[PDB]
């Protein structure tokens, strides 16, 4: 009887987030998952990848005049998972299309001509399978690269290859 | 009451567009210019270029489902500027936002290491000198890169440091 | 490209349609699906919505002389879907810019003032996901108030408000 | 805050249904469909139906005491389906043997001397297909009329010849 069931996370206070101001809603159980770079640098220690996601939500929010950061989730290379507006919050990473209906996962970093760690890779797994096990996203959800749904090079070529292979992986 | 011949703009059948299925319109004149690039191949013949616009029409509408390509206008290596969505349909290129309040133009070609040679720098300042002269764009027009309004790179490094030094260009 | 059948309709015989002389087809996928009202009585039994079907078709039919009931497939407030033109037929309900690149599905009835049931708003919704299905619409379709793209009141305040919040509402 | 599900299905509440407290669980994807008729009185109307679901459910809790009505689904002959202990409630409908492994779906009324109308028949084919498209019915799936299933007049006379002659109807 385990009920709790998935996944390590970075809070979002871990990471010294600000609080958010986005209050509209995604419908659980979510059928599209998203991945996307960062398109900006890596990291690969945990002080360097809260560092990094402060940054990340500092350009969406500072600059762009965001709610929040982007993302549902980021994910780092020190094999950690940062929150962002997470599961049951409308993200701003794919358009007026995509962000309604989909949870959007940000690898930390740029994967043009760079894989990321093996670590990263699990850990990005590992969420969807904890987002199947709360029933945040459908059974039989489906992934898509950024590039997939939106004019970009985003999640990079080395990345797209690899989330290519991926079990829930639709084009 | 004056009309002039500003355009040198080579027309969508010439560059032999697919017909666009976008009605959305735009109010004149427009307040916003938003740059972009296209992060992709750079073409510097008016034939490569014709072929250019076709691909990124082609991932546009083909890939990604779209009524057109999503830019507004176009600019080559070659100097000449390639009809899009045109000045009084609305682009899909920066966002909800922006989109409907701007004019989207995307020079082909990724900008990150290269500078656009100077004379698709004339096209773009003569294109939107063009706009005001119709009275497509506010005399006052405001330029923003692509990444001042949508987390992305482009208009790309170098490209972007040129367009802060604009006129119109506007924090 | 897919044999599986999708949705419940009413057909043609049996609601004793006139049989129709309409050939000028659509082409598939449909981008547009544009929502109407008939603005005429309104009918909640299998029995009342087959015989106000076939008087907006005789309307149209002897009154408009046009080829069939102008619209594509009529919605009623028996919860059932009445197929007018069909999936693969140009109907005319939207004037000559949007007719021949839309599905026009109307509620029979007039909703200036009245909701249509619950179940009305089902069987439409349902009706456009087996368009889908079928690959007469495309998985990116729009939906559109008669009045977005007309001068009209159709399809009525307060169905109207209803749309807006569909999935797929592009004003 | 999602778009609807397949098969128009009225819900629960919509037809004024006493809360259910059954808890049993069916495993999809399920493989038997098990067709009955209620041998209860008929209706033509979605008052009418609505009604009628009430009052078979009435008898089932408040009279045989169980935990909700004992069919999966209704079919009522004003062409809409009646959402009754739905895809992932265990019913009683058939017996110990079939209730675990099948879906029960019944058309309300007597079918002895009478056959339920086209769109009764259409909304039960759509929905066995809604099913399979939500994974609750396998694709591959066999439909039993009561009677193999258990020593019973039901699905009526008439009612039985039809479904025979469905694809998915096994000896």
Same sequence: chains 1, 2, 3, 4.
């Avoid at 986005?22 to 770079?37: D, G, I, M, N, Q």
């Avoid at 500072?62 to 929040?68: A, E, I, Q, V, Y």
Wanted: hydrophobic share 35%; proline share 7%; aromatic share 8%.
């Amino acid at each position: 009887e385990d009920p709790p069931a998935c996944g390590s996370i970075v809070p979002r206070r871990e990471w010294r987030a600000l609080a958010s101001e986005c209050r509209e809603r995604l419908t659980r159980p979510v059928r599209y998952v998203v991945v996307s770079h960062t398109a900006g640098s890596h990291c690969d220690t945990p002080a360097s990848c809260a560092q990094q996601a402060q940054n990340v939500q500092s350009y969406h929010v500072r600059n762009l005049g965001w709610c929040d950061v982007g993302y549902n989730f980021l994910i780092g290379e020190d094999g950690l998972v940062y929150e962002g507006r997470g599961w049951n919050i409308k993200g701003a990473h794919a358009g007026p299309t995509w962000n309604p209906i989909s949870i959007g996962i940000s690898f930390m970093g740029n994967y043009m001509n760079r894989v990321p760690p093996p670590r990263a890779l699990r850990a990005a797994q590992n969420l969807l399978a904890c987002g199947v096990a709360l029933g945040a996203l459908r059974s039989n959800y489906e992934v898509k690269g950024h590039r997939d749904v939106q004019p970009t090079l985003s999640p990079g070529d080395r990345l797209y290859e690899i989330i290519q292979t991926w079990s829930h992986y639709r084009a």
